């Protein structure tokens, strides 16, 4: 199984419109765009992000899939964003939908924001924190915080883990891979997603730290 680069929208105006929905949602939350992990003051240094600290180990991203990741990042940088649209929904808040076809195994985005110790975030009200590193020593555990800086990943919806039929809404998956010895969090399509289809993944895919009883 190999990661696939996304196919960005052929129409330049369509890519502009897409990028604009993300810009609007970021501006709405008073956030700055960041397509990388940021290591801020009074938070975690880049040195703290070391994959050998993962309790039980972390799978390594292969050379083939790293080139795929770099290819997607270069595309984002040049202007070829993934074919995603940020759309406000009254029942979910901001959501992400496919604004083009996304085949199975296609790289969607990296989960970005500020990396901080879980110990500095135990009572943080941010509705979008994501576990980065789960260390044996709980003072070494890290969390991604897209409260001030972040990308599209933080707007992607989750499934209700309590309903009999909610698992059916899941069309993408959040995995953690080792890249140059560091922890990285990625989103990948788990099935062929059509234009307009809402992206959903399991927020409780390893731990069960996110309350989903009320999700739609």
């Amino acid at each position: 199984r190999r990661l696939l680069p996304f196919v960005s929208s052929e129409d330049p105006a369509q890519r502009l419109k897409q990028m604009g929905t993300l810009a609007s949602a970021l501006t709405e939350l008073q956030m700055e765009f960041s397509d990388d992990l940021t290591y801020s003051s009074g938070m975690a240094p880049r040195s703290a992000n070391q994959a050998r600290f993962e309790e039980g180990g972390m799978q390594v991203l292969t050379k083939e899939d790293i080139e795929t990741l770099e290819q997607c990042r270069a595309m984002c940088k040049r202007g070829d964003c993934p074919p995603l649209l940020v759309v406000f929904d009254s029942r979910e808040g901001f959501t992400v939908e496919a604004d083009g076809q996304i085949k199975d195994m296609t790289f969607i985005a990296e989960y970005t924001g500020d990396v901080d110790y879980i110990r500095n975030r135990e009572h943080d009200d941010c509705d979008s924190m994501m576990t980065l590193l789960l260390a044996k020593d709980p003072s070494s555990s890290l969390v991604i915080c897209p409260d001030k800086r972040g990308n599209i990943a933080r707007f992607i919806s989750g499934i209700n883990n309590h309903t009999l039929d909610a698992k059916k809404k899941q069309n993408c998956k959040c995995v953690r891979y080792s890249v140059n010895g560091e922890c990285r969090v990625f989103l990948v399509a788990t099935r062929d997603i059509a234009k307009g289809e809402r992206l959903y993944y399991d927020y409780n895919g390893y731990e069960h730290e996110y309350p989903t009883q009320h999700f739609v």
Partner: peptide, 17 residues
């Protein structure tokens, strides 16, 4: 009064599929 903190988590083994 009591302060609680929601966190997403992802597997670090098993690949995508």
């Amino acid at each position: 009064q009591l302060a609680k903190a929601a966190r997403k988590s992802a597997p670090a083994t098993g690949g995508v599929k």
